Design a protein around this ligand. Structure first.
Ligand SMILES: *[C@@H]1O[C@H](CO)[C@@H](O[C@@H]2O[C@H](CO)[C@@H](O)[C@H](O)[C@H]2NC(C)=O)[C@H](O)[C@H]1NC(C)=O
Lengths: 53, 52
C-alpha cells in the first residue's frame, strides 16, 4: 500500500522444553552383578578321607 | 583257621584302605585347585573393569 509493504504477523510457539545432550562415559564395571553372584556360589566339595576306610 | 590264612586275610584288607585313601586325597586336592582357579579367574575379570 503506497510505497510501504506490509507483512503478516508471526505466530509464536507457546512453550519450549529443554533436553540437553549428556556425555556417555560407558563404564563397564556397573551392571556386572552377575559375576559377583557367581563368585558367591563357589561350592567347594571336600569328602572326609578315612571315614570310609 | 590256618595260621597263615587269617594273616593272608588281614593282608588283603591292609591295602584297599591305602588305595582308597590315595584316591580320596587326589580328589580333594583336585577340587581345591579347581576352586582356586575359578576364584582367580573371576577376580581377574572383575579387576580389569574397575581399572578401565
Ligand atoms: C543410559 O542407559 C541407556 C541404556 O543402556 C543408554 O542408551 C544406550 O546408549 C548406547 C550408546 O549411544 C546405544 O548404543 C544403545 O542403543 C542405547 N540403548 C538404549 C536402550 O537406548 C544411555 O546411553 C545411558 N545414558 C548415559 C548418559 O550414559
Amino acid at each position: 500500500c503506497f510505497g510501504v509493504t506490509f507483512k503478516k504477523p508471526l505466530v509464536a510457539e507457546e512453550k519450549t522444553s529443554l533436553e540437553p545432550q549428556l556425555p556417555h562415559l560407558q563404564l563397564r564395571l556397573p551392571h556386572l552383578v552377575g559375576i559377583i553372584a557367581k563368585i558367591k556360589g563357589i561350592k567347594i566339595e571336600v569328602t572326609s578321607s578315612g571315614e570310609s576306610i | 583257621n590256618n595260621n597263615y590264612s587269617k594273616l593272608r586275610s588281614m593282608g588283603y584288607a591292609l591295602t584297599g584302605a591305602v588305595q582308597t585313601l590315595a584316591q580320596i586325597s587326589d580328589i580333594n586336592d583336585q577340587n581345591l585347585q579347581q576352586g582356586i582357579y575359578l576364584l582367580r579367574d573371576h577376580i581377574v575379570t572383575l579387576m580389569e573393569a574397575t581399572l578401565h
